[PDB]
Amino acid sequence: MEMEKEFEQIDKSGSWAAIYQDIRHEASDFPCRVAKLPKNKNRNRYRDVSPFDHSRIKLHQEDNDYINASLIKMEEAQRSYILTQGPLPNTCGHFWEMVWEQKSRGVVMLNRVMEKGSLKCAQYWPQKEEKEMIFEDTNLKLTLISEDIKSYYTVRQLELENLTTQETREILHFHYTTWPDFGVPESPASFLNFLFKVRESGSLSPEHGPVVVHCSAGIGRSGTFCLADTCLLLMDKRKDPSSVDIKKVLLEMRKFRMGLIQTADQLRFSYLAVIEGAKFI
Numbered sequence: 001m002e003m004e005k006e007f008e009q010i011d012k013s014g015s016w017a018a019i020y021q022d023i024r025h026e027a028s029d030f031p032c033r034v035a036k037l038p039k040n041k042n043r044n045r046y047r048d049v050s051p052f053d054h055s056r057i058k059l060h061q062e063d064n065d066y067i068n069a070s071l072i073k074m075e076e077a078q079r080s081y082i083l084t085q086g087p088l089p090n091t092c093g094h095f096w097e098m099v100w101e102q103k104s105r106g107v108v109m110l111n112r113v114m115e116k117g118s119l120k121c122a123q124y125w126p127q128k129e130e131k132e133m134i135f136e137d138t139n140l141k142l143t144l145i146s147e148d149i150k151s152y153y154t155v156r157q158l159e160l161e162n163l164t165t166q167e168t169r170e171i172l173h174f175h176y177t178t179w180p181d182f183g184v185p186e187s188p189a190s191f192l193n194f195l196f197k198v199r200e201s202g203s204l205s206p207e208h209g210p211v212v213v214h215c216s217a218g219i220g221r222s223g224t225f226c227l228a229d230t231c232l233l234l235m236d237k238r239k240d241p242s243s244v245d246i247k248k249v250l251l252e253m254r255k256f257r258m259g260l261i262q263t264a265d266q267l268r269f270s271y272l273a274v275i276e277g278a279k280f281i
């Protein structure tokens, strides 16, 4: 059963909601005790989106190691990702500290800072070359070097400096700017072109740390990005690409972060992206 044939059946029967609820029912549940400590209340954007203790990213400054971020480690696909929430006004320094400590080369952002009148993410990078950001709490400086604005996404070149050592690193910011305010994109073509730009940058390679991916909560749109990338890698690696079961991969990813793919529409879109992206590979 090619994925295309399955998709046709699901679409005809209108069963995307039933299949999505099955995934929810089967998903892993593990503790999130650290996330729930009182002193970490202001570090969580949403009270019902927490990282599991087993897979959470620890900040290395002693103090408070907590950030709402999870390491998704896909063993068969040989790729890792860090999924995180959109930074809060008080956690932008922790975010960049994470990127520094984890040796990430890329940040993937799948939201806009404001959507439907409402703040989804803090403005955690500089909009102007001449107006750099200093995160005084984690002793980091961030400068916009250049950007390449296109119709569906923007790629920025950032310089991140550890002010303690004066070491600097180039970080690439991949910003998908056109996800609709409601629902999902009608066609995955632009999402796929975005994904291919991330890939081609080398940001997902094993010589770097895991890419950091976020949206607002770091589980819906972010989950589509990692699910589509992993299923496409599994397709190219396996002798038989039609043995890739996207529901099984998503369940695997949900061992590492709760909630990945938040709606039936997102699940459908993930299928569509993997179908069309497989056609290109």
Ligand SMILES: Cc1ccc2nc(C(F)(F)F)cc(N3CCN[C@@H](CO)C3)c2c1
Pocket: 010, 011, 012, 014, 016, 017, 183, 184, 185, 186, 187, 264, 265, 266, 268
């Ligand atoms: C033909 C057909 C069959 C089943 C469907 N099932 C869902 C669901 F996943 F939400 F349940 C969503 C659909 N649509 C509407 C069209 N525009 C799309 C948004 O871009 C989503 C959809 C469409």
Ligand SMILES: Cc1ccc2nc(C(F)(F)F)cc(N3CCN[C@H](CO)C3)c2c1
Pocket: 188, 189, 190, 192, 193, 195, 196, 197, 199, 232, 277, 280, 281
């Ligand atoms: C030749 C080639 C090889 C690998 C590829 N890998 C990906 C993806 F998604 F895996 F990164 C996406 C591709 N393309 C680019 C062209 N436009 C297409 C849809 O608009 C998507 C692609 C194309």
